[PDB]
Design an enzyme around this catalytic site. Structure first.
Site, PDB file in Angstrom:
ATOM      1  N   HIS A   1     -26.646  16.983  39.472  1.00  0.00           N
ATOM      2  CA  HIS A   1     -25.813  17.969  40.143  1.00  0.00           C
ATOM      3  C   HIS A   1     -26.497  19.130  40.954  1.00  0.00           C
ATOM      4  CE1 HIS A   1     -26.329  19.676  35.944  1.00  0.00           C
ATOM      5  NE2 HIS A   1     -26.659  20.553  36.843  1.00  0.00           N
TER       6      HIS A   1
ATOM      7  N   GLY B   1     -29.252  28.005  34.960  1.00  0.00           N
ATOM      8  CA  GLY B   1     -30.705  27.804  35.345  1.00  0.00           C
ATOM      9  C   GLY B   1     -31.265  27.020  34.435  1.00  0.00           C
TER      10      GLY B   1
ATOM     11  N   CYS C   1     -30.762  23.730  33.340  1.00  0.00           N
ATOM     12  CA  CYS C   1     -30.657  22.466  33.497  1.00  0.00           C
ATOM     13  C   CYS C   1     -31.971  21.750  34.141  1.00  0.00           C
ATOM     14  CB  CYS C   1     -29.509  22.039  34.681  1.00  0.00           C
ATOM     15  SG  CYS C   1     -27.948  22.429  33.966  1.00  0.00           S
TER      16      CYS C   1
HETATM   17  C1  LIG Z   1     -26.853  23.791  34.937  1.00  0.00           C
HETATM   18  O1  LIG Z   1     -26.261  23.283  35.963  1.00  0.00           O
HETATM   19  C2  LIG Z   1     -27.715  24.934  35.474  1.00  0.00           C
HETATM   20  O2  LIG Z   1     -28.637  25.663  34.640  1.00  0.00           O
HETATM   21  N1  LIG Z   1     -27.801  24.984  36.662  1.00  0.00           N
HETATM   22  C3  LIG Z   1     -28.495  26.047  37.315  1.00  0.00           C
HETATM   23  C4  LIG Z   1     -25.838  24.192  33.778  1.00  0.00           C
HETATM   24  C5  LIG Z   1     -26.393  24.773  32.467  1.00  0.00           C
HETATM   25  C6  LIG Z   1     -25.409  25.588  31.631  1.00  0.00           C
HETATM   26  C7  LIG Z   1     -24.974  26.925  32.203  1.00  0.00           C
HETATM   27  C8  LIG Z   1     -24.723  27.609  31.016  1.00  0.00           C
HETATM   28  N2  LIG Z   1     -25.504  27.089  30.043  1.00  0.00           N
HETATM   29  C9  LIG Z   1     -25.659  25.833  30.316  1.00  0.00           C
HETATM   30  O3  LIG Z   1     -26.045  24.845  29.528  1.00  0.00           O
HETATM   31  N3  LIG Z   1     -24.853  23.160  33.685  1.00  0.00           N
HETATM   32  C10 LIG Z   1     -23.611  23.435  34.120  1.00  0.00           C
HETATM   33  O4  LIG Z   1     -23.181  24.577  34.650  1.00  0.00           O
HETATM   34  C11 LIG Z   1     -22.656  22.221  34.251  1.00  0.00           C
HETATM   35  C12 LIG Z   1     -23.032  21.072  35.395  1.00  0.00           C
HETATM   36  C13 LIG Z   1     -23.157  19.665  35.101  1.00  0.00           C
HETATM   37  C14 LIG Z   1     -21.733  18.825  34.743  1.00  0.00           C
HETATM   38  C15 LIG Z   1     -22.545  18.650  36.287  1.00  0.00           C
HETATM   39  N4  LIG Z   1     -21.477  22.732  33.865  1.00  0.00           N
HETATM   40  C16 LIG Z   1     -20.424  22.650  35.051  1.00  0.00           C
HETATM   41  C17 LIG Z   1     -19.357  23.094  34.937  1.00  0.00           C
HETATM   42  F1  LIG Z   1     -18.403  23.413  35.902  1.00  0.00           F
HETATM   43  C18 LIG Z   1     -19.017  23.855  33.775  1.00  0.00           C
HETATM   44  C19 LIG Z   1     -19.831  23.709  32.548  1.00  0.00           C
HETATM   45  N5  LIG Z   1     -19.326  23.932  31.377  1.00  0.00           N
HETATM   46  C20 LIG Z   1     -18.687  25.128  31.122  1.00  0.00           C
HETATM   47  O5  LIG Z   1     -17.914  25.660  31.766  1.00  0.00           O
HETATM   48  O6  LIG Z   1     -18.671  25.420  29.718  1.00  0.00           O
HETATM   49  C21 LIG Z   1     -17.767  25.225  28.617  1.00  0.00           C
HETATM   50  C22 LIG Z   1     -16.529  26.252  29.251  1.00  0.00           C
HETATM   51  C23 LIG Z   1     -18.337  25.863  27.426  1.00  0.00           C
HETATM   52  C24 LIG Z   1     -17.470  23.906  28.742  1.00  0.00           C
HETATM   53  C25 LIG Z   1     -20.959  23.081  32.654  1.00  0.00           C
HETATM   54  O7  LIG Z   1     -21.812  22.846  31.766  1.00  0.00           O
END
Ligand SMILES: *[C@](O)(C(=O)NC)[C@H](C[C@@H]1CCNC1=O)NC(=O)[C@H](CC1CC1)n1cc(F)cc(NC(=O)OC(C)(C)C)c1=O
Ligand SMILES: *[C@](O)(C(=O)NC)[C@H](C[C@@H]1CCNC1=O)NC(=O)[C@H](CC1CC1)n1cc(F)cc(NC(=O)OC(C)(C)C)c1=O
Lengths: 305, 302
Positions: B41, B143, B145
Site C-alpha cells: 500500500h 509511519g 508500516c
Molecule cells: C501504515 O500505512 C503507515 O504507517 N503508513 C505511513 C499505517 C499504520 C497505521 C497508522 C496508525 N497506526 C497504524 O498501525 N496503516 C494504515 O494506515 C492502514 C493501511 C493498510 C490497509 C492497507 N490503514 C488504512 C486505513 F484506511 C485505515 C486503517 N485503520 C484505521 O483507520 O484504524 C481503525 C479505525 C482503528 C480501524 C489502517 O490501518
C-alpha cells in the site's frame, strides 16, 4: 495507537559488548575506542569477594591475566586502571563500531534501556527505571555483570548503568560508567539493605496521560484536586509526594490531551481509593510507574534517531 | 534472577531498515541482499484506501517512482514485484549488513520482538505475541508500516511479521514476509474487526513457572488436576484449551522446578476461580500470557 514498554534500539550498544575473563570469572565489558570498561570485581576469587581489597588484588594482576574477546577475535590488553568500581582495560585496537557516546549519571525516576549480555553476547533488551531507592528491578543471572543500560538522545548513546549485583527481592544495583554506585551499595558479597521503595507519582500520571492518548479513558472524572489534597491521599499509598516541579513537567502531556494535571491527579486519587474494580488501563491491572513523561511523548509522537 | 518482558537485541534488524517513498506515502522497507520488502500500500494514496486496485496502481508505477533511502544513500530500484500484500523492490546494491535470515510464519501464542520504525529509522523495540485472534497488541503510529517482528536464534534472524494496519480497539494486523496476512484481514479500509481474544494458557503456565524459578510460590497449592477437568475451567474463563503438545512443551520448566504441569494447572484453576485476591505475581496483578515456554527458558538460563 497502542502503548508498550519500549526499549531503545540496541545495535549501537551491541557492537560495544565484549567478553572479559579473569581467571575463573568471565563477565561482560564495554569496548569504546581503545578501552574496555567492566566491573572491577572481575579480578576477585570467591574468597576475595567476601571482603575484597581491590588494591591488593589489582597489583597482583598482569595485563596477561585479562582475556578480552570481541566475538571470535582476542584483543590485546596493553594497560589496566581502576576508577572507583570499574576496571578500564586499555587495548591496542579501537572498537570500529564505537558510537558517539557520553557517560551520564541518571536520577531516580529516570528510565533507561538495559542490554542483558552473557559471555559478551547480547541476549535481550528491556526497559528499567532507577527506583527512588537507587535500585532497578531487572533480569540478571550470573554472567550478566557488565551489562549496561543506556539512553539514546539525538546523535548520542548515553551510557548510565553498569550492572554489578543482586539485592534481596531480586532487584539490582550497579554503577555509572565512572564506577560510582547508585545508592549506598558496595561491590562485595555482604548483606546489604535496599532501603524502602516508593511509587514514582509523576510517572504514574504520565502513564495515565498515555492511557488517555491511546483511547483508554474510563478512569477520567470531572473532579479535580489541590496538590496538597492529592499528596495527603498519596502518602497513604506510598507514592512519592508530587511537587510543582512534577506538575510542570507533565505540562506538554497536559496540553496535548486538554486535561489539567490536577484533573488527572483526581483520577489518580479515585484509582488509589476505589481501585480499578475489575478493569485495566493499557492492559494492566495495577498502576505503572516506569514510564517518564518523556517516554510517553517519545512513544506517542514516534521520535526516532 | 528477576523476570522482564524482553526483546531480542535489535541491531541485526536495524541494519536492514530503509525508507521507501512512492509519491506521497513514506513507510519502512526491509533491505535483505538486493531486495527491499515493504507493504504494497506504499503505492496508495488515501482516495485509494477505500477500495484499491493494487495491480493497476502497480502497473502505473515504474522503478523510478520508488525512492529507497538507506540513511543517506538513495538506493536505485532496478526491479519491482508484488507478492501477495508485500512489494519486492530489487535494488542495485546488496545490503552488506544483511544477517543470516529466514522468513517464517509463526503460530498464535508465539512471541516476537517488534522494532518500530519511522522514516527508515529505528525508533524502539518491544516484545509482543501473535494473539489467537491473529492480532498483536503493538505500538504503531502513522509511519510505522513496514516495521517487522522477528526472533533471533543464534546468528539467524527469523522474520515473522510486517506491519500493515491498526484495527479498532487499537490492535494491529500484518503479514508474514511473503505478504500473507495473519488472520482474515485485508489491506483495504473496510469492515474489519479483530474478534474477541482468548488468553494463551500455555504461556500463562510458562509464566507461573517463571514466578516459581524466581522464588515466588505463594500461589502453589497441594493439588493436581486432569487435562479434561482443567479445560472445562479454561473454557469458562476464555483460555485456550491446553493440549498434550502444550504439556510436552512445558516439560523443561516442569522438570527444572519439580512441579508437574497439571499440578501447576491446579494452581491456575485456583487463580482463575478465586482471583489473585490482592496479591501479585512477578510484579503483576493479572495473569501474563505473552511469554512462551522458550522465552522463560531463554531468559531464566542464558
Ligand atoms: C501504515 O500505512 C503507515 O504507517 N503508513 C505511513 C499505517 C499504520 C497505521 C497508522 C496508525 N497506526 C497504524 O498501525 N496503516 C494504515 O494506515 C492502514 C493501511 C493498510 C490497509 C492497507 N490503514 C488504512 C486505513 F484506511 C485505515 C486503517 N485503520 C484505521 O483507520 O484504524 C481503525 C479505525 C482503528 C480501524 C489502517 O490501518
Ligand atoms: C556478576 O558479577 C556476574 O554476572 N558475574 C559472572 C554477578 C551478577 C549477579 C548474580 C545473580 N544475579 C546478579 O545480578 N554479580 C554478583 O554476583 C555480585 C558481585 C558483588 C561484588 C558486587 N554478587 C556476588 C555475590 F556473591 C552475591 C550477590 N548477591 C546475593 O547474594 O544476593 C542476595 C542473596 C540478595 C544477597 C551478588 O550480587
Amino acid at each position: 495507537s497502542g502503548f508498550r514498554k519500549m526499549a531503545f534500539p540496541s545495535g549501537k550498544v551491541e557492537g560495544c559488548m565484549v567478553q572479559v575473563t579473569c581467571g575463573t570469572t568471565t563477565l561482560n565489558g564495554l569496548w569504546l575506542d581503545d578501552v574496555v570498561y567492566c566491573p572491577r570485581h572481575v579480578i576477585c576469587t570467591s574468597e576475595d569477594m567476601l571482603n575484597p581489597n581491590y588494591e591488593d588484588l589489582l597489583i597482583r594482576k598482569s595485563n596477561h591475566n585479562f582475556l578480552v574477546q570481541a566475538g571470535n577475535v582476542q584483543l590485546r590488553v596493553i594497560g589496566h586502571s581502576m576508577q572507583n568500581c570499574v576496571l578500564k582495560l586499555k587495548v591496542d585496537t579501537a572498537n570500529p563500531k564505537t558510537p558517539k557516546y557520553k557517560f551520564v549519571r541518571i536520577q531516580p525516576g529516570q528510565t533507561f534501556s538495559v542490554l542483558a549480555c552473557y559471555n559478551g553476547s547480547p541476549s535481550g533488551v528491556y526497559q528499567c527505571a532507577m527506583r527512588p531507592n537507587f535500585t532497578i528491578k531487572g533480569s540478571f543471572l550470573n554472567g550478566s555483570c557488565g551489562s549496561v543500560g543506556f539512553n539514546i538522545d539525538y546523535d548520542c548513546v548515553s551510557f548510565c548503568y553498569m550492572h554489578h549485583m543482586e539485592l534481596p527481592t531480586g532487584v539490582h544495583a550497579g554503577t555509572d560508567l565512572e564506577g560510582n554506585f547508585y545508592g549506598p551499595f558496595v561491590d562485595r558479597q555482604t548483606a546489604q539493605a535496599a532501603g524502602t521503595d516508593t511509587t514514582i507519582t509523576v510517572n504514574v500520571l504520565a502513564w495515565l496521560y498515555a492511557a488517555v492518548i491511546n483511547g483508554d479513558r474510563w478512569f477520567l472524572n470531572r473532579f479535580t484536586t489541590t496538590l496538597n489534597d492529592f499528596n495527603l491521599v498519596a502518602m497513604k499509598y506510598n507514592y512519592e509526594p508530587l511537587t510543582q516541579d512534577h506538575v510542570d513537567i507533565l505540562g506538554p502531556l497536559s496540553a496535548q490531551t486538554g486535561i489539567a494535571v490536577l484533573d488527572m491527579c483526581a483520577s489518580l486519587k479515585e484509582l488509589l481509593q476505589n481501585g480499578m474494580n475489575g478493569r485495566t488501563i493499557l492492559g494492566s491491572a495495577l498502576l505503572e510507574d516506569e514510564f517518564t513523561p518523556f517516554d510517553v511523548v517519545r512513544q506517542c509522537s514516534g521520535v526516532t534517531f
